[PDB]
Short mmCIF file of C-alpha atoms and ligand atoms in Angstrom, two decimals:
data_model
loop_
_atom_site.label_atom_id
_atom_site.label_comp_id
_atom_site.label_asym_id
_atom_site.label_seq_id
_atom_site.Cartn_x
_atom_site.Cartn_y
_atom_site.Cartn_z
CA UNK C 11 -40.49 -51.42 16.32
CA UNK C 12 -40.52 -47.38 15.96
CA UNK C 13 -38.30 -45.46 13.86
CA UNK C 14 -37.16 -42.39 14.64
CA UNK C 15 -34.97 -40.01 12.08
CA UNK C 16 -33.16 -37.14 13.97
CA UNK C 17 -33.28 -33.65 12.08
CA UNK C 18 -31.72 -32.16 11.14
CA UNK C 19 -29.27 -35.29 9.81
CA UNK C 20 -26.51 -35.70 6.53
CA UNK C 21 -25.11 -33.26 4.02
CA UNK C 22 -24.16 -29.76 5.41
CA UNK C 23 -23.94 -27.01 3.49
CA UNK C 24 -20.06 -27.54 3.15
CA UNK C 25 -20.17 -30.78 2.06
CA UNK C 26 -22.83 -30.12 -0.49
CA UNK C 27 -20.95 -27.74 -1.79
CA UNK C 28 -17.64 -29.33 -1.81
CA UNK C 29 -19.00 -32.22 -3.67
CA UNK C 30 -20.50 -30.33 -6.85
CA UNK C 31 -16.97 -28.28 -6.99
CA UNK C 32 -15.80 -31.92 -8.32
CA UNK C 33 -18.35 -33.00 -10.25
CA UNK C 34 -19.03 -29.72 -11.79
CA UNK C 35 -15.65 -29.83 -12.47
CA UNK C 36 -15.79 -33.08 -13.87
CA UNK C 37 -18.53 -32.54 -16.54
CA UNK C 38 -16.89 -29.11 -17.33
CA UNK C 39 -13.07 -30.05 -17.90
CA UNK C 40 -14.06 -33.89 -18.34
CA UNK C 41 -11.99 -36.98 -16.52
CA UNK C 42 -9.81 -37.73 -15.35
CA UNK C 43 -9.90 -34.95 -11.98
CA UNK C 44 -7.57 -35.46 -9.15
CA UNK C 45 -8.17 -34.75 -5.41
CA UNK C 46 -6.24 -34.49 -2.76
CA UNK C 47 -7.68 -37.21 0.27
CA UNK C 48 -11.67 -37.76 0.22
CA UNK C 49 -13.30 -34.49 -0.71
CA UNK C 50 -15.38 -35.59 2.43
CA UNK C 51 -14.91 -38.42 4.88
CA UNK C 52 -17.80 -40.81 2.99
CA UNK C 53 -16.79 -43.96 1.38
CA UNK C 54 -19.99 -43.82 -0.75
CA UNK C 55 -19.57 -40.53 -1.95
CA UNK C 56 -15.46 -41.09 -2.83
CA UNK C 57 -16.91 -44.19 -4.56
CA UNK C 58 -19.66 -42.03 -6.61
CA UNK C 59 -17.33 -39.81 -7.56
CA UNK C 60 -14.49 -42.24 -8.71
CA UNK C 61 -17.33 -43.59 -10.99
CA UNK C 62 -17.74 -39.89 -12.36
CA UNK C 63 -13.72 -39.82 -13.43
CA UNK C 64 -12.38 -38.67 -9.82
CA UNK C 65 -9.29 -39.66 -8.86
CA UNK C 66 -7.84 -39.29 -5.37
CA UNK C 67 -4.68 -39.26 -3.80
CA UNK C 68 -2.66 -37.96 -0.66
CA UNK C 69 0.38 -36.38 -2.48
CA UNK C 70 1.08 -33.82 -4.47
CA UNK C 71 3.85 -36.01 -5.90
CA UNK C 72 1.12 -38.19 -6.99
CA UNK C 73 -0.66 -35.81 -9.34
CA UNK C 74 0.40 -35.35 -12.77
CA UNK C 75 1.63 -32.05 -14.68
CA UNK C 76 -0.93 -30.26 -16.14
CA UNK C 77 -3.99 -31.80 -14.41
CA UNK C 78 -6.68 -30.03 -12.23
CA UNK C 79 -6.18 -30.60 -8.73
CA UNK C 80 -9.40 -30.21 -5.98
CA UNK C 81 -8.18 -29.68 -2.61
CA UNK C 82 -10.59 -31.26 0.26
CA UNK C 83 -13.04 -29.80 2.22
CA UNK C 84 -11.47 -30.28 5.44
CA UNK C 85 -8.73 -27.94 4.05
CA UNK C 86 -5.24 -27.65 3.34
CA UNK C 87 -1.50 -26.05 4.77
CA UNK C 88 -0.13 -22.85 3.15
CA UNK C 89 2.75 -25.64 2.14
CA UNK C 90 0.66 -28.06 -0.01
CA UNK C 91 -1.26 -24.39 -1.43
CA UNK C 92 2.45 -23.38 -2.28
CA UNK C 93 3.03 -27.09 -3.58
CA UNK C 94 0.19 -26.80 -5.95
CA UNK C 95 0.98 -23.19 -6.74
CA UNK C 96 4.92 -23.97 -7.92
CA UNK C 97 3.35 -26.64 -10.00
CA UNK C 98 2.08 -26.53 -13.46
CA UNK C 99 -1.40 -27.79 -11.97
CA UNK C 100 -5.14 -26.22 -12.02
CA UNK C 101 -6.40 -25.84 -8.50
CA UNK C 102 -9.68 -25.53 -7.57
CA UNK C 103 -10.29 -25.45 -3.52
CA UNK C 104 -13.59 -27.26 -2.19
CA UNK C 105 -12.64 -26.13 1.57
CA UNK C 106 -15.53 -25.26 3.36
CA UNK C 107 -15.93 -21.32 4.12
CA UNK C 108 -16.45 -22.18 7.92
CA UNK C 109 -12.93 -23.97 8.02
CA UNK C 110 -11.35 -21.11 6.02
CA UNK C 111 -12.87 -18.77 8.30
CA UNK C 112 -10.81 -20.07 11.37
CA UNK C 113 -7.40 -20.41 8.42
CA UNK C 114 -7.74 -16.61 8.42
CA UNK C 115 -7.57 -16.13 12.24
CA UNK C 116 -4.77 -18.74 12.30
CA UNK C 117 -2.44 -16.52 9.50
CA UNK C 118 -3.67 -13.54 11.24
CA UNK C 119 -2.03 -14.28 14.54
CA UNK C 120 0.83 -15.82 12.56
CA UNK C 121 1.30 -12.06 11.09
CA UNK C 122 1.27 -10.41 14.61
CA UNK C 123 3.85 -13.11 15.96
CA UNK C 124 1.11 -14.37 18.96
CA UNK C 125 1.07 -17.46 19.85
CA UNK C 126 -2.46 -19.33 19.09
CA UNK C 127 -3.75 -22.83 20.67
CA UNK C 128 -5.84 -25.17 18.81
CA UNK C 129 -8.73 -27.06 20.34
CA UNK C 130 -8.44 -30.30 18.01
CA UNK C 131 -7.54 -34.26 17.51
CA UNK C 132 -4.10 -34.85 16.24
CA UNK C 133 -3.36 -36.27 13.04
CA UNK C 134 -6.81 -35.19 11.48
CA UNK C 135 -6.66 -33.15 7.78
CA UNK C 136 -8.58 -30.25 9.26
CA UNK C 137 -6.43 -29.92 12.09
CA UNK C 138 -2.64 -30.59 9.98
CA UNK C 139 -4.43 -27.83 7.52
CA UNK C 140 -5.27 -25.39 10.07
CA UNK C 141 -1.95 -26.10 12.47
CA UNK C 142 -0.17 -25.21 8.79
CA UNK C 143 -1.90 -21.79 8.58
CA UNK C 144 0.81 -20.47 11.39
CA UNK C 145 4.33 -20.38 10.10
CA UNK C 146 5.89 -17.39 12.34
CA UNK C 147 8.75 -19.02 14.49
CA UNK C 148 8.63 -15.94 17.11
CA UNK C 149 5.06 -16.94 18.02
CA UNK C 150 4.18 -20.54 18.30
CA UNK C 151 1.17 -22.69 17.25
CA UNK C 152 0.13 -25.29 19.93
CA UNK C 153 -2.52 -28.24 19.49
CA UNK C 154 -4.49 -29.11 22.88
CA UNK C 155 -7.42 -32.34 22.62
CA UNK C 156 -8.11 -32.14 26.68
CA UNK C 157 -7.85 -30.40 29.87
CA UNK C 158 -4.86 -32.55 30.72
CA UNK C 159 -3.17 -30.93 27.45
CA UNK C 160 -3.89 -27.49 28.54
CA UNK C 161 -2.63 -28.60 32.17
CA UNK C 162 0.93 -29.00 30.47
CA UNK C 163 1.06 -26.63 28.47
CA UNK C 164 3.72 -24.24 28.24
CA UNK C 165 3.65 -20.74 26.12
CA UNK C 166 6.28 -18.13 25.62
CA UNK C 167 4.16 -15.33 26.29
CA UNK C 168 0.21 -15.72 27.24
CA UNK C 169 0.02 -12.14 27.02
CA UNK C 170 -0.70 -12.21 23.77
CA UNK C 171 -2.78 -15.35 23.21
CA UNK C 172 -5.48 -16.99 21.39
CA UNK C 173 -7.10 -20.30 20.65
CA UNK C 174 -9.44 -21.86 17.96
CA UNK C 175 -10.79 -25.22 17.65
CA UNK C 176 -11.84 -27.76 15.02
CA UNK C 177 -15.15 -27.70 13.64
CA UNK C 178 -16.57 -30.58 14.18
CA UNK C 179 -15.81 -31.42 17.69
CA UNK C 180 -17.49 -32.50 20.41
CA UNK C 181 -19.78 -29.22 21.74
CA UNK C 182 -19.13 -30.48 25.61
CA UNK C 183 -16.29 -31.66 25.56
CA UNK C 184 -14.48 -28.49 24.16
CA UNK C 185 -16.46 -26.67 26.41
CA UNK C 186 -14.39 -28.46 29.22
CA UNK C 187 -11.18 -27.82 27.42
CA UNK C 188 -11.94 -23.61 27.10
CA UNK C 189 -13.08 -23.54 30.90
CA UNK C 190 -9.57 -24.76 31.19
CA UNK C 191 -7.43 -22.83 29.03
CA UNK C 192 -8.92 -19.56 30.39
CA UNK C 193 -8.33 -20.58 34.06
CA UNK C 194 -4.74 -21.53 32.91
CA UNK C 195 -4.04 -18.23 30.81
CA UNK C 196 -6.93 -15.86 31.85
CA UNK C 197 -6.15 -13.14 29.04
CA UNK C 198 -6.57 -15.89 26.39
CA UNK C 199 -9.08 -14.80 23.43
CA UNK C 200 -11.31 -16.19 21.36
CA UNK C 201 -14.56 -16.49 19.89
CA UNK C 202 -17.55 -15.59 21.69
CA UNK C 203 -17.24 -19.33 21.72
CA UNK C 204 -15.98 -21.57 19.85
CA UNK C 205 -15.39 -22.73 15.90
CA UNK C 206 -17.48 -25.83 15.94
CA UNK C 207 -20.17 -24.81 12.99
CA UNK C 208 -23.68 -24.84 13.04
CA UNK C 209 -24.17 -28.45 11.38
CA UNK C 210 -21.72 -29.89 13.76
CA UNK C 211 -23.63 -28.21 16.78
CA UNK C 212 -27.04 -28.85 15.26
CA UNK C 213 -26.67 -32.73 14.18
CA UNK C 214 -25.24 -33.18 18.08
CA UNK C 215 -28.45 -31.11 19.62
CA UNK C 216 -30.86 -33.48 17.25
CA UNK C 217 -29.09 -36.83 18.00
CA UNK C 218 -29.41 -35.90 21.72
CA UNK C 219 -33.08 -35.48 21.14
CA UNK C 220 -33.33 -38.57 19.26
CA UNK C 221 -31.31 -40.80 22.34
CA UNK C 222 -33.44 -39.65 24.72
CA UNK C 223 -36.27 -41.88 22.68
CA UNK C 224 -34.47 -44.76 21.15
CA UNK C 225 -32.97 -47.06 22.93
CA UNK C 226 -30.78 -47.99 20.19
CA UNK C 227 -29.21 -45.12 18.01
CA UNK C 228 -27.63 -45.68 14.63
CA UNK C 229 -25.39 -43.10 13.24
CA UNK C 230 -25.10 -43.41 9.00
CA UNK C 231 -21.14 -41.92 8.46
CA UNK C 232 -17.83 -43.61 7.71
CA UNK C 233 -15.19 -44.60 10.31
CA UNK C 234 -12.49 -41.80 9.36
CA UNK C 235 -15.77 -39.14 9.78
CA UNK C 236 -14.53 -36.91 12.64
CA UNK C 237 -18.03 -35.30 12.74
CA UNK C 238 -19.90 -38.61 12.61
CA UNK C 239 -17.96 -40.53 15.53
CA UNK C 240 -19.03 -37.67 17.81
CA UNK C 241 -22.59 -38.41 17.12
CA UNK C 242 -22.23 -41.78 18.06
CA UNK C 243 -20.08 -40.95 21.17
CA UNK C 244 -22.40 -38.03 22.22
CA UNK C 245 -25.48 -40.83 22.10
CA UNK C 246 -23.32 -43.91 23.96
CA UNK C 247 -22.49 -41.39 26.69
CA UNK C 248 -26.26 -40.78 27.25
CA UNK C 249 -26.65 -44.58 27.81
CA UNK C 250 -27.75 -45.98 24.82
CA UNK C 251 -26.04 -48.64 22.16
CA UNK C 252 -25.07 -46.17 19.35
CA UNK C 253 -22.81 -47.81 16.26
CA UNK C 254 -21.51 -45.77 13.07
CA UNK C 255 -22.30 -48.00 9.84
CA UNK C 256 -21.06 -47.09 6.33
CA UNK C 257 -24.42 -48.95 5.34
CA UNK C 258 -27.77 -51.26 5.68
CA UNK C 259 -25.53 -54.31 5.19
CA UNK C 260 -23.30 -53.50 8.98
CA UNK C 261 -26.42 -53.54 10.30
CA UNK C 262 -26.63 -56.66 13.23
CA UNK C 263 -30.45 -58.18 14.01
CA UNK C 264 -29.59 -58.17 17.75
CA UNK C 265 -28.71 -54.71 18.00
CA UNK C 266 -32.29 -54.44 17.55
CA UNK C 267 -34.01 -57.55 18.35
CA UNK C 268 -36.84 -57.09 21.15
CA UNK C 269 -35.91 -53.12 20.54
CA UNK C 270 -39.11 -50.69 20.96
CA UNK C 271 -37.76 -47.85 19.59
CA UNK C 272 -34.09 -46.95 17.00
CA UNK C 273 -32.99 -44.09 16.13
CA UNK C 274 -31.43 -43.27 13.05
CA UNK C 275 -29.47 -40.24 11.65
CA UNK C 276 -26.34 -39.11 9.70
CA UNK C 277 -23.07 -37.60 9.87
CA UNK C 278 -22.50 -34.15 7.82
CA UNK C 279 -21.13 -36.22 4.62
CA UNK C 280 -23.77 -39.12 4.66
CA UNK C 281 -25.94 -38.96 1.83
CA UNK C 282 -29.70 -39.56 1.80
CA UNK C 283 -29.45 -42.35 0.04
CA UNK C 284 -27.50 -44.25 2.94
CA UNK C 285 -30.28 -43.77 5.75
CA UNK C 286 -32.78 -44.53 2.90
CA UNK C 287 -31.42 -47.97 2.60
CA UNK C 288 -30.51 -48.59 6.47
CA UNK C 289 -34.32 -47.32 7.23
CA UNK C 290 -35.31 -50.36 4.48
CA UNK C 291 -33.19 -52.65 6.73
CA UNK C 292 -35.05 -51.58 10.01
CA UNK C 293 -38.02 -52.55 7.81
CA UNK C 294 -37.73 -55.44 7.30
CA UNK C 295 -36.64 -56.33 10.68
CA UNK C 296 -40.12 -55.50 11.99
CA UNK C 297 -39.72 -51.88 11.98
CA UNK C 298 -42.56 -49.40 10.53
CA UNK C 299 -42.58 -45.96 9.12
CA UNK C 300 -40.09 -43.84 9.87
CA UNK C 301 -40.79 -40.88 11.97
CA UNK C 302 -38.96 -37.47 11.27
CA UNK C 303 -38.86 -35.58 14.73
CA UNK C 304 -38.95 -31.85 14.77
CA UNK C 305 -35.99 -30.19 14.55
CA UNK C 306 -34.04 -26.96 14.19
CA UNK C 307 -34.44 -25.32 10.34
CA UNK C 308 -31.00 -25.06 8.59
CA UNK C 309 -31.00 -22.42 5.96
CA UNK C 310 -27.53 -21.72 4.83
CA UNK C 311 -26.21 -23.00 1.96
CA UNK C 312 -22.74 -22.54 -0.07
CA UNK C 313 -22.61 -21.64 -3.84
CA UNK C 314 -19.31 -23.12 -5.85
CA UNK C 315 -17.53 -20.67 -7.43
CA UNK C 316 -19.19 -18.87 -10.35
CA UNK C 317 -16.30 -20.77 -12.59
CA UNK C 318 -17.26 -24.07 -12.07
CA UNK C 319 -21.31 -22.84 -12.20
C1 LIG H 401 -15.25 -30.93 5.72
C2 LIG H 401 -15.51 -31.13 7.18
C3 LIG H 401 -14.70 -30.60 8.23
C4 LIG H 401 -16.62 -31.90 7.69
C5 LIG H 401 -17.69 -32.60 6.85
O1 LIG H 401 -17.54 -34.03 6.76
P1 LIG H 401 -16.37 -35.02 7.12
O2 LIG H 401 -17.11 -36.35 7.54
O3 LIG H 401 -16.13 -35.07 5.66
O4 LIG H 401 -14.95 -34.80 7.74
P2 LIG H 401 -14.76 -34.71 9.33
O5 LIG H 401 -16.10 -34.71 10.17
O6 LIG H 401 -13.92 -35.89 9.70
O7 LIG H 401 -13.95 -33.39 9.61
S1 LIG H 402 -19.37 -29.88 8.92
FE1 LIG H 402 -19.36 -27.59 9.20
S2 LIG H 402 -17.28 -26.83 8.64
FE2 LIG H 402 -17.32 -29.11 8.02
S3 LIG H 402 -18.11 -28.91 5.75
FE3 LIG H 402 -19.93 -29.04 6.95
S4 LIG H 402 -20.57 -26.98 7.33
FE4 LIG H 402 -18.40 -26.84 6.72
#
């Protein structure tokens, strides 16, 4: 049995980033360091940090006066920033700059009272943080997931209208969703594209490469990873068996018994380790050395903020 290891594959510069912000905070202000939700959407990495003195929780309410307070990378509302803020608590925000980037757009059309539509899935942090960047009741912030949305939708003035999306979507599917909203309101702006970043698009460009030579595609990322799932999805919809494991150990022998050739790569907050230990697995179910296919260079990365350096 080949294996294959898309590239690029894990950590993006965001997450990379957004994980030193607590442990450099850790070893600077010592334990115990609260966080609001997973930094990042990885079991492992939650569990590392836990280990390091993090502590995480999902309300405000939750955290204690005095202590430091991280928010998440996926980002947070300008209520739970004004929750922190008319607190007596330390806050230190590992967002990444590419979700802040499309915050700013969000308050900006909140300023000039247009209405803005969100390309995004419902009840996920980034999207609840973005949505909360709008708060002017003249204008109106709408959330669309699929044409069908768009097909219902109803604005007060499309005029005066513009649309961002989540950033780690699904680069075809919101495609489909755009093509819509512009035949639906054709003076609708927006980016030159869209706001789906360039380690969402590149880890769905390399696991395409990678289905079309394993038959059998294994995608290293927990089950609440929005950017993760859509790797999987993206390689089940070209035909293949694709499944999302936290680890080695979810690993089934008959998902690759008799199996010529498996693919392996990793969400935006899987860490090395993980595909290290899941390519050990393959291993030892007959397969040999892993192969790294070519892939597209990634270059950017994200300092934390000279306080925490
Ligand atoms: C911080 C963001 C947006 C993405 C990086 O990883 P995640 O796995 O942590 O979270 P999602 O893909 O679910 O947004
Ligand atoms: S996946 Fe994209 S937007 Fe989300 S943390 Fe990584 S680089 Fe930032």
């Amino acid at each position: 049995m080949q294996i294959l290891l898309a590239n690029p594959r894990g950590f993006c510069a965001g997450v990379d980033r957004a994980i030193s912000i607590v442990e450099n905070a850790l070893a600077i202000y010592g334990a115990p360091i609260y966080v609001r939700h997973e930094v990042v959407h990885n079991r492992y990495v939650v569990d590392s940090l836990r280990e390091r003195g993090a502590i995480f929780i999902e309300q405000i309410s939750e955290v204690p006066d005095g202590a430091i307070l991280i928010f998440s990378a996926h980002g947070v509302s300008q209520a739970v920033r004004n929750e922190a803020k008319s607190r007596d608590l330390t806050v230190f925000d590992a967002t990444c700059p590419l979700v802040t980037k499309v915050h700013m757009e969000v308050a900006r059309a909140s300023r000039r009272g247009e209405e803005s539509i969100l390309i995004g899935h419902a009840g996920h942090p980034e999207v609840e943080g973005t949505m909360g960047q709008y708060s002017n009741p003249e204008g109106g912030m709408y959330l669309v997931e699929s044409p069908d949305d768009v097909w219902k939708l109803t604005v007060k003035n499309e005029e005066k209208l513009s649309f961002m999306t989540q950033t780690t979507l699904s680069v075809d599917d919101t495609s489909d969703v755009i093509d819509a909203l512009r035949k639906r309101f054709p003076k609708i702006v927006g980016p030159r594209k869209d706001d789906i970043c360039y380690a969402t698009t590149n880890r769905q460009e390399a696991v395409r490469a990678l289905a079309e030579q394993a038959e059998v595609v294994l995608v290293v990322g927990s089950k609440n990873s929005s950017n993760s799932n859509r790797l999987a999805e993206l390689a089940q919809r070209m035909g293949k068996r694709a499944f999302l494991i936290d680890d080695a150990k979810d690993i089934q022998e008959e998902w690759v018994k008799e199996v010529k050739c498996v693919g392996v790569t990793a969400g935006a907050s899987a860490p090395d380790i993980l595909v290290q230990n899941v390519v050990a697995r393959l291993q030892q179910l007959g397969g040999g050395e892993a192969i790294p296919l070519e892939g597209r260079e990634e270059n950017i990365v994200f300092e934390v903020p000279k306080e925490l350096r």
